[PDB]
Design an enzyme around this catalytic site. Sequence first.
Site, short mmCIF file in Angstrom:
data_model
loop_
_atom_site.label_atom_id
_atom_site.label_comp_id
_atom_site.label_asym_id
_atom_site.label_seq_id
_atom_site.Cartn_x
_atom_site.Cartn_y
_atom_site.Cartn_z
N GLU A 204 -7.91 -82.25 35.98
CA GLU A 204 -6.81 -83.21 36.01
C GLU A 204 -7.07 -84.22 34.92
O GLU A 204 -8.12 -84.88 34.92
CB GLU A 204 -6.72 -83.87 37.38
CG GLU A 204 -5.95 -83.04 38.36
CD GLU A 204 -5.94 -83.62 39.75
OE1 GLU A 204 -7.01 -84.04 40.26
OE2 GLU A 204 -4.82 -83.83 40.25
N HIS A 215 -11.60 -80.10 46.91
CA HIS A 215 -10.89 -80.56 48.11
C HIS A 215 -11.02 -79.48 49.18
O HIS A 215 -10.21 -78.53 49.19
CB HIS A 215 -9.41 -80.79 47.86
CG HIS A 215 -9.06 -81.93 46.95
ND1 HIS A 215 -8.88 -83.22 47.40
CD2 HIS A 215 -8.80 -81.95 45.62
CE1 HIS A 215 -8.55 -83.99 46.38
NE2 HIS A 215 -8.49 -83.25 45.29
#
Length: 396
Positions: A204, A215
Amino acid sequence: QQIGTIPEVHPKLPTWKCTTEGGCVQQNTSVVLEYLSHPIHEVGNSDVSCVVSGGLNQSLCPNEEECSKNCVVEGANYTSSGVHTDGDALTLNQYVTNGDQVVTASPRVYLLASDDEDGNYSMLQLLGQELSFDVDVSKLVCGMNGALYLSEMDASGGRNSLNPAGAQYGSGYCDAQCGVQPFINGTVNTGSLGACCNEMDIWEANALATALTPHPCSVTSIYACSGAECGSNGVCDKPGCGYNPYALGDHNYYGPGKTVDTSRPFTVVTQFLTNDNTTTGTLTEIRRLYVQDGNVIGPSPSDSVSSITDSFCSTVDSYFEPLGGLKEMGEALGRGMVLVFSIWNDPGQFMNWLDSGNAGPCNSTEGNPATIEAQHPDTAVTFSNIRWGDIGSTFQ
Ligand SMILES: *[C@@H]1O[C@H](CO)[C@@H](O[C@@H]2O[C@H](CO)[C@@H](O[C@@H]3O[C@H](CO)[C@@H](O)[C@H](O)[C@@H]3O)[C@H](O)[C@H]2NC(C)=O)[C@H](O)[C@H]1NC(C)=O
Ligand SMILES: *[C@@H]1O[C@H](CO)[C@@H](O)[C@H](O)[C@H]1NC(C)=O
Ligand SMILES: *[C@@H]1O[C@H](CO)[C@@H](O)[C@H](O)[C@H]1NC(C)=O
Ligand SMILES: *[C@@H]1O[C@H](CO)[C@@H](O)[C@H](O)[C@H]1NC(C)=O
Ligand SMILES: *[C@@H]1O[C@H](CO)[C@@H](O)[C@H](O)[C@H]1NC(C)=O
Protein backbone atom coordinates in the site's frame (compact mmCIF):
# COMPACT_ATOMS: atom_id res chain seq x y z
CA GLN A 1 -27.72 -12.44 -11.76
CA GLN A 2 -27.34 -14.03 -15.17
CA ILE A 3 -24.79 -12.97 -17.79
CA GLY A 4 -25.84 -10.30 -20.30
CA THR A 5 -24.71 -9.79 -23.87
CA ILE A 6 -22.17 -6.97 -23.70
CA PRO A 7 -18.93 -8.97 -24.01
CA GLU A 8 -16.52 -9.16 -21.07
CA VAL A 9 -13.01 -8.78 -22.46
CA HIS A 10 -10.28 -9.03 -19.85
CA PRO A 11 -7.12 -6.94 -20.40
CA LYS A 12 -4.24 -9.38 -20.77
CA LEU A 13 -1.44 -9.23 -18.19
CA PRO A 14 1.27 -11.87 -18.48
CA THR A 15 2.90 -12.96 -15.23
CA TRP A 16 5.74 -15.31 -14.24
CA LYS A 17 6.14 -18.38 -12.04
CA CYS A 18 9.79 -18.84 -11.10
CA THR A 19 11.87 -21.72 -9.73
CA THR A 20 15.48 -22.12 -8.65
CA GLU A 21 16.21 -24.88 -11.16
CA GLY A 22 13.80 -23.97 -13.96
CA GLY A 23 13.82 -20.20 -14.02
CA CYS A 24 10.78 -18.10 -14.83
CA VAL A 25 7.86 -19.26 -16.95
CA GLN A 26 5.26 -16.90 -18.37
CA GLN A 27 1.58 -17.40 -17.49
CA ASN A 28 -1.15 -16.25 -19.89
CA THR A 29 -2.89 -14.42 -17.06
CA SER A 30 -5.35 -11.54 -17.40
CA VAL A 31 -7.13 -9.09 -15.15
CA VAL A 32 -10.82 -8.65 -14.22
CA LEU A 33 -12.72 -5.65 -12.78
CA GLU A 34 -14.68 -5.85 -9.55
CA TYR A 35 -18.18 -7.27 -10.02
CA LEU A 36 -19.82 -4.01 -8.88
CA SER A 37 -17.87 -2.14 -11.58
CA HIS A 38 -19.83 -4.07 -14.16
CA PRO A 39 -23.30 -2.93 -15.18
CA ILE A 40 -25.90 -4.94 -13.26
CA HIS A 41 -29.39 -4.10 -14.47
CA GLU A 42 -32.91 -5.41 -14.97
CA VAL A 43 -33.46 -7.90 -17.79
CA GLY A 44 -35.99 -5.66 -19.49
CA ASN A 45 -34.31 -2.33 -18.96
CA SER A 46 -30.65 -1.35 -18.77
CA ASP A 47 -31.70 1.93 -17.12
CA VAL A 48 -32.96 0.11 -14.00
CA SER A 49 -29.87 -0.81 -12.00
CA CYS A 50 -29.92 -3.72 -9.54
CA VAL A 51 -27.29 -2.06 -7.35
CA VAL A 52 -28.43 1.42 -6.35
CA SER A 53 -26.84 3.58 -3.63
CA GLY A 54 -24.22 0.86 -3.20
CA GLY A 55 -26.91 -1.61 -2.10
CA LEU A 56 -29.55 -3.95 -3.49
CA ASN A 57 -32.59 -2.77 -5.40
CA GLN A 58 -35.07 -4.44 -3.02
CA SER A 59 -37.86 -4.59 -5.61
CA LEU A 60 -35.65 -6.71 -7.90
CA CYS A 61 -33.35 -8.49 -5.39
CA PRO A 62 -35.27 -9.53 -2.26
CA ASN A 63 -33.43 -12.86 -2.31
CA GLU A 64 -30.97 -14.78 -4.44
CA GLU A 65 -33.47 -16.47 -6.77
CA GLU A 66 -35.46 -13.32 -7.54
CA CYS A 67 -32.26 -11.34 -8.03
CA SER A 68 -30.89 -14.07 -10.30
CA LYS A 69 -33.96 -13.94 -12.48
CA ASN A 70 -34.52 -10.16 -12.57
CA CYS A 71 -30.92 -9.02 -13.10
CA VAL A 72 -28.08 -9.47 -15.61
CA VAL A 73 -24.43 -8.52 -15.21
CA GLU A 74 -22.89 -6.96 -18.33
CA GLY A 75 -19.39 -6.70 -19.70
CA ALA A 76 -17.43 -3.67 -18.51
CA ASN A 77 -15.65 -0.87 -20.39
CA TYR A 78 -12.19 -1.17 -18.85
CA THR A 79 -10.80 2.12 -20.15
CA SER A 80 -13.72 4.16 -18.82
CA SER A 81 -13.00 2.35 -15.51
CA GLY A 82 -9.35 3.47 -15.51
CA VAL A 83 -7.71 0.11 -16.36
CA HIS A 84 -5.04 -0.32 -19.04
CA THR A 85 -2.53 -3.05 -19.81
CA ASP A 86 0.49 -2.72 -22.09
CA GLY A 87 2.70 -5.78 -22.33
CA ASP A 88 3.48 -6.88 -18.79
CA ALA A 89 2.33 -3.57 -17.26
CA LEU A 90 -0.99 -2.74 -15.56
CA THR A 91 -1.85 0.95 -15.20
CA LEU A 92 -4.62 2.04 -12.82
CA ASN A 93 -5.96 5.59 -13.18
CA GLN A 94 -7.80 7.13 -10.22
CA TYR A 95 -9.81 9.49 -12.46
CA VAL A 96 -11.13 9.48 -16.04
CA THR A 97 -12.49 12.40 -18.06
CA ASN A 98 -15.38 13.05 -20.43
CA GLY A 99 -14.24 16.48 -21.55
CA ASP A 100 -14.47 19.07 -18.80
CA GLN A 101 -15.84 16.60 -16.23
CA VAL A 102 -13.60 14.41 -14.09
CA VAL A 103 -15.04 11.06 -13.00
CA THR A 104 -13.78 8.96 -10.10
CA ALA A 105 -12.86 5.56 -11.55
CA SER A 106 -10.73 4.11 -8.75
CA PRO A 107 -10.59 0.55 -10.17
CA ARG A 108 -9.99 -2.71 -8.35
CA VAL A 109 -8.98 -5.77 -10.41
CA TYR A 110 -8.13 -9.43 -9.77
CA LEU A 111 -5.64 -11.72 -11.53
CA LEU A 112 -7.39 -14.40 -13.63
CA ALA A 113 -5.74 -17.71 -14.46
CA SER A 114 -8.10 -18.41 -17.38
CA ASP A 115 -10.47 -16.46 -19.60
CA ASP A 116 -12.64 -19.54 -20.19
CA GLU A 117 -16.30 -19.55 -19.22
CA ASP A 118 -15.37 -21.42 -16.02
CA GLY A 119 -11.95 -19.84 -15.58
CA ASN A 120 -10.90 -19.11 -11.99
CA TYR A 121 -8.70 -16.56 -10.31
CA SER A 122 -5.03 -17.40 -9.95
CA MET A 123 -4.58 -18.93 -6.50
CA LEU A 124 -1.08 -17.80 -5.53
CA GLN A 125 0.55 -20.05 -2.94
CA LEU A 126 3.30 -17.92 -1.40
CA LEU A 127 4.20 -19.84 1.79
CA GLY A 128 7.97 -20.36 1.63
CA GLN A 129 7.91 -18.34 -1.61
CA GLU A 130 8.46 -14.78 -2.78
CA LEU A 131 6.59 -12.28 -4.91
CA SER A 132 8.35 -9.54 -6.89
CA PHE A 133 6.97 -6.70 -8.96
CA ASP A 134 8.17 -3.49 -10.55
CA VAL A 135 6.19 -0.37 -9.68
CA ASP A 136 6.01 3.26 -10.76
CA VAL A 137 4.52 5.29 -7.89
CA SER A 138 5.99 8.60 -9.06
CA LYS A 139 2.49 9.93 -9.93
CA LEU A 140 0.87 8.89 -6.60
CA VAL A 141 0.55 12.05 -4.50
CA CYS A 142 -0.31 12.48 -0.81
CA GLY A 143 -3.57 10.75 0.07
CA MET A 144 -3.31 8.27 -2.80
CA ASN A 145 -3.03 4.53 -2.26
CA GLY A 146 -1.88 2.20 -5.02
CA ALA A 147 -2.25 -1.28 -3.61
CA LEU A 148 -1.18 -4.79 -4.53
CA TYR A 149 -2.37 -7.44 -2.10
CA LEU A 150 -3.85 -10.87 -1.54
CA SER A 151 -7.31 -11.95 -0.36
CA GLU A 152 -8.49 -15.47 0.48
CA MET A 153 -11.43 -15.16 -1.91
CA ASP A 154 -12.99 -18.24 -3.48
CA ALA A 155 -11.16 -19.37 -6.60
CA SER A 156 -14.45 -19.29 -8.57
CA GLY A 157 -15.63 -16.04 -7.00
CA GLY A 158 -18.76 -17.73 -5.70
CA ARG A 159 -19.85 -19.17 -9.05
CA ASN A 160 -23.10 -21.17 -8.96
CA SER A 161 -26.25 -21.45 -11.05
CA LEU A 162 -27.79 -18.28 -9.61
CA ASN A 163 -24.43 -16.44 -9.93
CA PRO A 164 -23.03 -17.96 -13.14
CA ALA A 165 -20.71 -14.93 -13.54
CA GLY A 166 -18.10 -15.88 -10.92
CA ALA A 167 -14.44 -15.02 -11.37
CA GLN A 168 -15.05 -14.11 -15.03
CA TYR A 169 -17.04 -11.02 -13.90
CA GLY A 170 -15.08 -10.13 -10.75
CA SER A 171 -17.33 -11.85 -8.24
CA GLY A 172 -16.68 -12.80 -4.62
CA TYR A 173 -14.40 -10.08 -3.18
CA CYS A 174 -13.56 -10.09 0.52
CA ASP A 175 -10.83 -8.70 2.74
CA ALA A 176 -10.01 -8.20 6.41
CA GLN A 177 -12.13 -5.04 6.62
CA CYS A 178 -15.38 -7.09 6.53
CA GLY A 179 -17.08 -4.49 4.40
CA VAL A 180 -20.82 -4.53 3.89
CA GLN A 181 -21.51 -5.13 0.20
CA PRO A 182 -24.60 -6.24 -1.74
CA PHE A 183 -23.22 -9.63 -2.80
CA ILE A 184 -21.04 -11.86 -0.61
CA ASN A 185 -19.37 -14.85 -2.29
CA GLY A 186 -21.80 -14.58 -5.17
CA THR A 187 -24.89 -14.52 -2.92
CA VAL A 188 -27.30 -11.64 -2.33
CA ASN A 189 -26.63 -9.89 0.99
CA THR A 190 -30.11 -8.67 1.89
CA GLY A 191 -28.98 -7.12 5.15
CA SER A 192 -25.78 -5.75 6.62
CA LEU A 193 -23.47 -8.79 6.56
CA GLY A 194 -19.78 -8.08 5.90
CA ALA A 195 -17.42 -9.94 3.52
CA CYS A 196 -14.44 -11.19 5.56
CA CYS A 197 -11.32 -13.17 4.79
CA ASN A 198 -7.60 -13.33 5.52
CA GLU A 199 -5.81 -10.49 3.76
CA MET A 200 -2.08 -9.97 3.06
CA ASP A 201 -1.36 -6.34 2.08
CA ILE A 202 1.97 -6.71 0.32
CA TRP A 203 1.92 -3.13 -0.95
CA GLU A 204 0.00 0.00 0.00
CA ALA A 205 1.85 3.06 -1.12
CA ASN A 206 2.26 6.39 -2.80
CA ALA A 207 5.46 8.28 -3.67
CA LEU A 208 5.78 9.45 -0.05
CA ALA A 209 5.23 6.34 2.11
CA THR A 210 4.64 2.58 2.00
CA ALA A 211 3.11 -0.05 4.28
CA LEU A 212 3.24 -3.86 4.42
CA THR A 213 0.37 -5.21 6.53
CA PRO A 214 -0.75 -8.77 7.33
CA HIS A 215 -4.43 -8.93 8.41
CA PRO A 216 -5.42 -12.34 9.84
CA CYS A 217 -8.92 -13.62 10.45
CA SER A 218 -10.16 -16.48 12.58
CA VAL A 219 -11.87 -18.00 9.52
CA THR A 220 -10.58 -19.73 6.37
CA SER A 221 -11.66 -18.42 2.96
CA ILE A 222 -14.62 -16.04 2.67
CA TYR A 223 -17.07 -15.47 5.52
CA ALA A 224 -20.20 -13.34 5.95
CA CYS A 225 -19.92 -11.66 9.36
CA SER A 226 -22.84 -10.39 11.41
CA GLY A 227 -22.81 -7.75 14.14
CA ALA A 228 -19.80 -7.68 16.44
CA GLU A 229 -18.16 -10.33 14.20
CA CYS A 230 -17.60 -7.40 11.80
CA GLY A 231 -15.97 -5.28 14.52
CA SER A 232 -12.38 -4.12 14.58
CA ASN A 233 -11.37 -7.10 16.71
CA GLY A 234 -14.10 -9.48 15.50
CA VAL A 235 -13.46 -12.41 13.19
CA CYS A 236 -10.85 -10.26 11.41
CA ASP A 237 -7.96 -7.99 12.35
CA LYS A 238 -8.92 -4.67 10.74
CA PRO A 239 -5.85 -2.67 11.92
CA GLY A 240 -3.35 -5.38 11.02
CA CYS A 241 0.37 -5.51 11.61
CA GLY A 242 1.53 -2.45 9.64
CA TYR A 243 5.23 -2.18 8.64
CA ASN A 244 6.20 1.32 7.40
CA PRO A 245 9.91 2.23 7.30
CA TYR A 246 9.25 5.93 7.87
CA ALA A 247 7.23 5.19 11.01
CA LEU A 248 9.78 2.65 12.28
CA GLY A 249 12.67 5.06 12.35
CA ASP A 250 14.19 5.94 8.98
CA HIS A 251 12.68 9.04 7.40
CA ASN A 252 15.19 8.79 4.52
CA TYR A 253 14.59 5.17 3.41
CA TYR A 254 11.65 5.60 1.03
CA GLY A 255 10.46 8.58 -1.00
CA PRO A 256 11.54 11.13 -3.63
CA GLY A 257 15.32 11.23 -3.90
CA LYS A 258 15.65 8.80 -0.98
CA THR A 259 17.35 5.41 -0.65
CA VAL A 260 14.45 3.80 -2.52
CA ASP A 261 13.90 6.71 -4.91
CA THR A 262 10.18 6.93 -5.65
CA SER A 263 10.88 9.58 -8.32
CA ARG A 264 11.40 6.66 -10.69
CA PRO A 265 10.51 2.96 -10.97
CA PHE A 266 11.78 0.20 -8.72
CA THR A 267 11.33 -3.47 -7.81
CA VAL A 268 9.57 -4.72 -4.66
CA VAL A 269 10.47 -8.19 -3.35
CA THR A 270 8.48 -9.84 -0.53
CA GLN A 271 9.66 -13.14 0.97
CA PHE A 272 7.47 -15.29 3.21
CA LEU A 273 10.11 -17.24 5.10
CA THR A 274 9.27 -20.48 6.91
CA ASN A 275 11.10 -22.04 9.84
CA ASP A 276 12.37 -25.01 7.78
CA ASN A 277 12.84 -23.16 4.44
CA THR A 278 10.12 -25.31 2.83
CA THR A 279 6.77 -24.45 1.32
CA THR A 280 5.08 -26.44 4.09
CA GLY A 281 6.81 -25.09 7.19
CA THR A 282 5.53 -22.38 9.46
CA LEU A 283 5.60 -18.76 8.35
CA THR A 284 7.95 -17.05 10.79
CA GLU A 285 9.25 -14.00 8.95
CA ILE A 286 8.13 -11.62 6.19
CA ARG A 287 11.08 -9.86 4.56
CA ARG A 288 11.19 -6.88 2.16
CA LEU A 289 13.89 -6.03 -0.40
CA TYR A 290 13.93 -3.36 -3.10
CA VAL A 291 15.92 -3.33 -6.31
CA GLN A 292 16.80 -0.08 -8.03
CA ASP A 293 19.65 0.80 -10.39
CA GLY A 294 20.59 -2.86 -10.29
CA ASN A 295 21.26 -2.63 -6.55
CA VAL A 296 19.56 -4.75 -3.92
CA ILE A 297 18.41 -2.49 -1.09
CA GLY A 298 17.77 -4.41 2.12
CA PRO A 299 15.98 -3.31 5.27
CA SER A 300 17.15 -0.04 6.77
CA PRO A 301 19.48 -0.58 9.76
CA SER A 302 17.95 2.61 11.20
CA ASP A 303 14.55 0.94 11.50
CA SER A 304 13.79 -0.61 14.87
CA VAL A 305 13.25 -3.98 13.20
CA SER A 306 14.36 -5.40 9.88
CA SER A 307 11.39 -7.63 9.05
CA ILE A 308 7.91 -8.60 10.18
CA THR A 309 7.75 -11.23 12.94
CA ASP A 310 5.18 -12.17 15.57
CA SER A 311 6.97 -10.16 18.28
CA PHE A 312 7.13 -7.08 16.05
CA CYS A 313 3.44 -7.45 15.28
CA SER A 314 2.44 -7.77 18.90
CA THR A 315 4.19 -4.49 19.59
CA VAL A 316 2.01 -2.80 16.94
CA ASP A 317 -1.20 -4.91 16.96
CA SER A 318 -2.45 -6.74 20.04
CA TYR A 319 -5.01 -8.78 18.06
CA PHE A 320 -2.57 -10.24 15.51
CA GLU A 321 -1.50 -13.25 17.58
CA PRO A 322 -4.95 -14.20 19.04
CA LEU A 323 -6.08 -14.68 15.41
CA GLY A 324 -3.15 -17.05 14.76
CA GLY A 325 -0.37 -14.62 13.88
CA LEU A 326 2.07 -15.45 11.11
CA LYS A 327 1.49 -19.22 11.38
CA GLU A 328 -2.15 -18.95 10.33
CA MET A 329 -1.30 -16.14 7.89
CA GLY A 330 1.13 -18.55 6.23
CA GLU A 331 -1.50 -21.27 6.22
CA ALA A 332 -3.76 -18.93 4.25
CA LEU A 333 -0.84 -18.19 1.91
CA GLY A 334 -0.32 -21.94 1.49
CA ARG A 335 -3.97 -22.65 0.69
CA GLY A 336 -3.82 -19.99 -2.00
CA MET A 337 -5.00 -16.40 -2.35
CA VAL A 338 -6.23 -14.02 -5.05
CA LEU A 339 -3.97 -11.22 -6.33
CA VAL A 340 -5.72 -7.84 -6.13
CA PHE A 341 -4.65 -4.49 -7.64
CA SER A 342 -6.38 -1.23 -6.74
CA ILE A 343 -6.02 2.53 -6.64
CA TRP A 344 -8.09 4.66 -4.28
CA ASN A 345 -8.18 7.72 -2.04
CA ASP A 346 -9.94 8.56 1.22
CA PRO A 347 -12.57 11.29 1.82
CA GLY A 348 -12.58 10.42 5.52
CA GLN A 349 -8.98 10.45 6.78
CA PHE A 350 -7.07 11.39 3.57
CA MET A 351 -4.80 8.29 4.01
CA ASN A 352 -3.18 10.11 6.94
CA TRP A 353 -2.48 6.64 8.42
CA LEU A 354 -0.20 5.86 5.44
CA ASP A 355 1.73 9.04 4.63
CA SER A 356 1.15 11.73 7.33
CA GLY A 357 1.93 12.21 11.00
CA ASN A 358 4.36 9.55 12.22
CA ALA A 359 3.82 7.56 9.04
CA GLY A 360 5.09 9.95 6.37
CA PRO A 361 5.95 13.50 5.29
CA CYS A 362 2.56 14.64 4.03
CA ASN A 363 0.81 17.70 5.35
CA SER A 364 -2.36 16.61 7.13
CA THR A 365 -4.74 18.12 4.55
CA GLU A 366 -2.61 17.53 1.44
CA GLY A 367 -4.44 14.27 0.63
CA ASN A 368 -7.94 15.69 0.59
CA PRO A 369 -9.59 14.01 -2.45
CA ALA A 370 -11.01 17.43 -3.38
CA THR A 371 -7.52 18.84 -3.91
CA ILE A 372 -6.30 15.59 -5.49
CA GLU A 373 -9.04 15.76 -8.12
CA ALA A 374 -8.57 19.49 -8.68
CA GLN A 375 -4.78 19.42 -8.94
CA HIS A 376 -3.69 15.85 -9.78
CA PRO A 377 -6.42 14.30 -11.97
CA ASP A 378 -3.78 12.18 -13.75
CA THR A 379 -2.65 10.37 -10.60
CA ALA A 380 -2.08 6.70 -11.41
CA VAL A 381 0.03 3.64 -10.58
CA THR A 382 1.81 1.18 -12.90
CA PHE A 383 2.57 -2.39 -11.76
CA SER A 384 4.64 -4.60 -14.03
CA ASN A 385 6.96 -7.58 -14.26
CA ILE A 386 5.00 -9.61 -11.71
CA ARG A 387 6.75 -12.83 -10.67
CA TRP A 388 6.33 -15.30 -7.84
CA GLY A 389 8.11 -18.48 -6.94
CA ASP A 390 11.11 -19.91 -5.11
CA ILE A 391 13.00 -17.60 -2.75
CA GLY A 392 15.63 -15.75 -4.76
CA SER A 393 14.31 -16.85 -8.17
CA THR A 394 12.07 -13.86 -9.03
CA PHE A 395 14.58 -10.97 -9.11
CA GLN A 396 17.98 -9.66 -10.33
C1 LIG B 1 -18.46 -19.56 -1.89
O1 LIG B 1 -19.34 -19.87 -2.97
C2 LIG B 1 -18.96 -21.01 -3.76
C3 LIG B 1 -19.96 -21.11 -4.88
O2 LIG B 1 -21.23 -21.52 -4.37
C4 LIG B 1 -18.97 -22.24 -2.87
O3 LIG B 1 -18.51 -23.35 -3.64
C5 LIG B 1 -19.28 -24.49 -3.55
O4 LIG B 1 -19.47 -25.12 -2.29
C6 LIG B 1 -20.47 -26.15 -2.32
C7 LIG B 1 -20.60 -26.65 -0.90
O5 LIG B 1 -21.63 -25.96 -0.21
C8 LIG B 1 -20.05 -27.25 -3.29
O6 LIG B 1 -21.12 -28.19 -3.39
C9 LIG B 1 -20.84 -29.50 -3.12
O7 LIG B 1 -19.79 -29.79 -4.05
C10 LIG B 1 -19.19 -31.10 -3.91
C11 LIG B 1 -18.03 -31.19 -4.88
O8 LIG B 1 -17.23 -32.30 -4.49
C12 LIG B 1 -20.29 -32.14 -4.17
O9 LIG B 1 -19.74 -33.44 -4.05
C13 LIG B 1 -21.45 -31.95 -3.16
O10 LIG B 1 -22.46 -32.93 -3.36
C14 LIG B 1 -22.00 -30.50 -3.20
O11 LIG B 1 -22.74 -30.34 -4.42
C15 LIG B 1 -19.72 -26.69 -4.67
O12 LIG B 1 -19.08 -27.70 -5.44
C16 LIG B 1 -18.75 -25.51 -4.56
N1 LIG B 1 -18.55 -24.89 -5.87
C17 LIG B 1 -17.37 -24.43 -6.28
C18 LIG B 1 -17.34 -23.81 -7.65
O13 LIG B 1 -16.36 -24.52 -5.58
C19 LIG B 1 -18.05 -22.04 -1.68
O14 LIG B 1 -18.20 -23.13 -0.78
C20 LIG B 1 -18.36 -20.75 -0.93
N2 LIG B 1 -17.34 -20.53 0.08
C21 LIG B 1 -17.61 -20.41 1.38
C22 LIG B 1 -16.42 -20.23 2.27
O15 LIG B 1 -18.75 -20.41 1.81
C1 LIG C 1 1.15 -18.98 -22.63
O1 LIG C 1 0.71 -19.04 -24.02
C2 LIG C 1 1.49 -19.88 -24.90
C3 LIG C 1 0.79 -19.85 -26.24
O2 LIG C 1 -0.53 -20.36 -26.14
C4 LIG C 1 1.61 -21.30 -24.35
O3 LIG C 1 2.50 -22.06 -25.17
C5 LIG C 1 2.13 -21.29 -22.91
O4 LIG C 1 2.18 -22.62 -22.40
C6 LIG C 1 1.22 -20.41 -22.05
N1 LIG C 1 1.65 -20.44 -20.66
C7 LIG C 1 1.19 -21.34 -19.78
C8 LIG C 1 1.74 -21.25 -18.39
O5 LIG C 1 0.36 -22.19 -20.10
C1 LIG D 1 -15.32 3.19 -23.22
O1 LIG D 1 -15.40 4.56 -22.76
C2 LIG D 1 -14.56 5.48 -23.47
C3 LIG D 1 -14.81 6.84 -22.85
O2 LIG D 1 -15.50 6.72 -21.61
C4 LIG D 1 -14.85 5.45 -24.98
O3 LIG D 1 -13.92 6.28 -25.68
C5 LIG D 1 -14.77 4.03 -25.51
O4 LIG D 1 -15.14 4.01 -26.88
C6 LIG D 1 -15.70 3.13 -24.70
N1 LIG D 1 -15.69 1.77 -25.21
C7 LIG D 1 -16.81 1.16 -25.63
C8 LIG D 1 -16.64 -0.25 -26.13
O5 LIG D 1 -17.91 1.72 -25.59
C1 LIG E 1 16.16 -19.92 4.53
O1 LIG E 1 16.15 -18.98 3.42
C2 LIG E 1 16.92 -17.78 3.62
C3 LIG E 1 16.71 -16.91 2.41
O2 LIG E 1 17.96 -16.48 1.90
C4 LIG E 1 18.38 -18.15 3.82
O3 LIG E 1 19.14 -16.96 4.01
C5 LIG E 1 18.51 -19.06 5.03
O4 LIG E 1 19.87 -19.47 5.19
C6 LIG E 1 17.63 -20.30 4.89
N1 LIG E 1 17.71 -21.13 6.09
C7 LIG E 1 17.44 -20.69 7.34
C8 LIG E 1 17.59 -21.72 8.43
O5 LIG E 1 17.07 -19.54 7.57
C1 LIG F 1 -0.60 22.49 5.26
O1 LIG F 1 -1.10 22.52 6.60
C2 LIG F 1 -1.69 23.78 6.97
C3 LIG F 1 -2.15 23.64 8.40
O2 LIG F 1 -3.46 24.16 8.60
C4 LIG F 1 -2.83 24.16 6.01
O3 LIG F 1 -3.27 25.48 6.32
C5 LIG F 1 -2.39 24.07 4.56
O4 LIG F 1 -3.50 24.24 3.68
C6 LIG F 1 -1.74 22.72 4.28
N1 LIG F 1 -1.27 22.66 2.90
C7 LIG F 1 -1.90 22.01 1.91
C8 LIG F 1 -3.19 21.32 2.27
O5 LIG F 1 -1.45 21.98 0.77
